[PDB]
C-alpha cells in the first residue's frame, strides 16, 4: 500500500534561525572564528545530507527546495511573459517575422546605455532577444499583449503557489519517508499525469488554439483582426471552416473513425515551407500520441492494487 504519510508542524516557522547564521550544522552554528566560516556556510548550505543524517528530514528539505526552485522558474517565466507584454515588439514581430528582430528588453537612458536599444524594427528601440520566446508565442497563437500579461500574472500566481507549497510541505504539513520511498506511484503519476496528461493538454491547446491561429497567420492575417481562441472553441462554424473534421465532433474519436481527423493531425513530415518551423498538425498529433504512450506507460508499476510491476520485482 501507498499511504499519504505526512506529519503536522515538524519545524516552527520563525525568524530565529534567520538571525543566527549557519544554524544548520554543528561546526558552523557557532559563529565566525575566521572568514572561511562564510565560505563553508555557503558551501554546505544545501548539503542536506551533511546537516541531518536521516532521509526523512533530507527528503522534506529537498522537496520544499524543489518547490522554491519551481517558484523561481515560474517567477522567471512571469518575467519573460511580462517583458514580452509591456516591453516588447511582439505585435510588430507577428506582422513581419523576417525583418523585425525579436526584442523584449528595453534599457533605461541613464549613462549612455540607451544605445543598447537598437533599431530591431517595428517602431521599437530595444535589445534583440535570442530566447525564441516570440517563436513559442506564435506557436501558441498568442497575437496579443493582453494574453502575455495575464499569463504573466498567472505565472506570478503559480510562483506564490509554489512558494506557499514549499512552506506548507516543510513547516506546516510535511511528508515522511514512506511517501518519498514509494516510487511506483511517483513514476506512475509523473508518467501518466505529468508527462501523459501534460502532453495531452498541450495537444488540446494546439488542436484548439495553435493550429487555427497559426493557419490564419500563415494564410496572411493582421494579428489584431484574428479571432480569439475562445471564439474557435465556442463558435463551431469558425473552427469547422478551418478544419471540417471538427464538424463531425468526437464521434470520429469514439467510433474510431480517426481517418477523417487527418485534416489537423497529419503525419506530414518535414518543415512548414510558409514559416520554416515544423507542421503544427504534426506537432499536435505528436503530443497526442505521446500522451497516449505515457498514459499507458504510467500504469506499469504496482502502487496500491494488485496489478502492476514492482521495480524491486523487476
Amino acid at each position: 500500500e501507498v499511504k499519504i504519510l505526512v506529519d503536522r508542524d515538524p519545524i516552527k516557522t520563525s525568524f530565529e534561525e534567520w538571525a543566527k547564521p549557519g544554524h544548520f550544522s554543528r561546526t558552523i552554528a557557532k559563529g565566525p572564528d575566521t572568514t572561511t566560516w562564510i565560505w563553508n556556510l555557503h558551501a554546505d548550505a544545501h548539503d542536506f545530507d551533511s546537516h541531518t543524517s536521516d532521509l526523512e528530514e533530507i527528503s522534506r528539505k529537498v522537496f520544499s527546495a524543489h518547490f522554491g526552485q519551481l517558484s523561481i522558474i515560474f517567477l522567471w517565466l512571469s518575467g519573460m511573459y511580462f517583458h514580452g507584454a509591456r516591453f516588447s515588439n511582439y505585435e510588430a514581430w507577428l506582422s513581419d517575422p523576417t525583418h523585425i528582430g525579436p526584442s523584449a528588453q528595453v534599457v533605461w537612458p541613464i549613462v549612455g546605455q540607451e544605445i543598447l536599444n537598437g533599431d530591431v524594427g517595428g517602431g521599437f528601440r530595444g535589445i534583440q532577444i535570442t530566447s525564441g520566446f516570440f517563436q513559442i508565442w506564435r506557436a501558441s497563437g498568442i497575437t496579443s499583449e493582453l494574453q502575455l500579461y495575464c499569463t504573466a500574472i498567472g505565472a506570478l500566481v503559480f510562483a506564490a503557489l509554489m512558494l506557499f507549497a514549499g512552506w506548507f510541505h516543510y513547516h506546516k504539513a510535511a511528508p515522511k519517508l514512506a511517501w518519498f520511498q514509494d516510487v511506483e506511484s511517483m513514476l506512475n503519476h509523473h508518467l501518466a499525469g505529468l508527462l501523459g496528461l501534460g502532453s495531452l493538454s498541450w495537444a488540446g491547446h494546439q488542436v484548439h488554439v495553435s493550429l487555427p491561429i497559426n493557419q490564419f497567420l500563415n494564410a496572411g492575417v493582421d494579428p489584431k483582426e484574428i479571432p480569439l481562441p475562445h471564439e474557435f472553441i465556442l463558435n463551431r462554424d469558425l473552427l469547422a471552416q478551418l478544419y471540417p473534421s471538427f464538424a463531425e465532433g468526437a464521434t470520429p474519436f469514439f467510433t474510431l473513425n480517426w481517418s477523417k481527423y487527418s485534416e489537423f493531425l497529419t503525419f506530414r513530415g518535414g518543415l512548414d515551407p510558409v514559416t520554416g518551423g515544423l507542421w503544427l498538425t504534426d506537432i499536435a498529433h505528436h503530443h497526442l500520441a505521446i500522451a497516449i504512450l505515457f498514459l499507458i506507460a504510467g500504469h506499469m508499476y504496482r502502487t496500491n492494487w494488485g496489478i502492476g510491476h514492482g521495480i524491486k520485482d523487476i
Binding site: 500500500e1 499511504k3 499519504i4 505526512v6 506529519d7 503536522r8 506546516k172 515522511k176 464521434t251 496500491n304
Partner: protein, 219 residues
Amino acid sequence: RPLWFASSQSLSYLDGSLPGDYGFDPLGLSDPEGTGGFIEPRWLAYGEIINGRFAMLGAAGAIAPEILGKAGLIPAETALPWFQTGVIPPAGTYTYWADNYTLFVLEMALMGFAEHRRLQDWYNPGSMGKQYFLGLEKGLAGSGNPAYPGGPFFNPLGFGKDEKSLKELKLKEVKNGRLAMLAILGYFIQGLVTGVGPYQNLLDHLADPVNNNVLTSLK
C-alpha cells in the same frame, strides 16, 4: 456492515464511526496514520458533509429555475439554466440589480462572516459563543460535532433528539448529499457536452430517447 467496494485497509478506520460508513475508500484518502493539512479523516468527513450540503442547494436550486420555467410559475427571463445566469459570461448573462462582481463581493463578505466563524468553530469548538456578535452568538456556540452544530439558529426544530433518529437523518443527509454531488457533476458535464440546461437534457432523453448519450462532444 453494507460494504460498497471495501478494501483491506478501508476496514481499518471506516468501521462505523461516520454517517455513511460503507467502507468505500479504495484510494486511501482518510487513513488516520500519517495525516496533516486537509487530508485528515475528520476534515474529509466535514468536507463530504459540506460539499454535499452545498451540492444539495446547488442541485435543487439550479434545475429549480428550469423545473418551474418550463411549467410557468416564473417569468421566462428569470428561467435560465445554471450557466446562462452570469456564472458563465461566455455562455450567458442576466442583469440583476447589481453587476456580477458586486454580487461576488457580496457573496465573499457575507460568506466570510458565515464561514470564517465555522472555521474557528472547527479549530476550537467552544468559540462562537464568547464574542459579542450582536447577541446572536448564543445559538452559534453549541457544536458537539463540528459539521452538526445543532443550535437555536441551525437546528431550531429537534429533528433527531434521540440518537437513532439522528443517526438515520445523518445517513439520509450524506446519501442525499452524495446524490446531489453526483448530480452537480452531471450538471457540469452535461452543460459542457450539450450547452443546454439539465432539465432540457432530461426532457430530451425522456421524450424519444434517441441520441441520449450518443452526442459525445457536440453542441
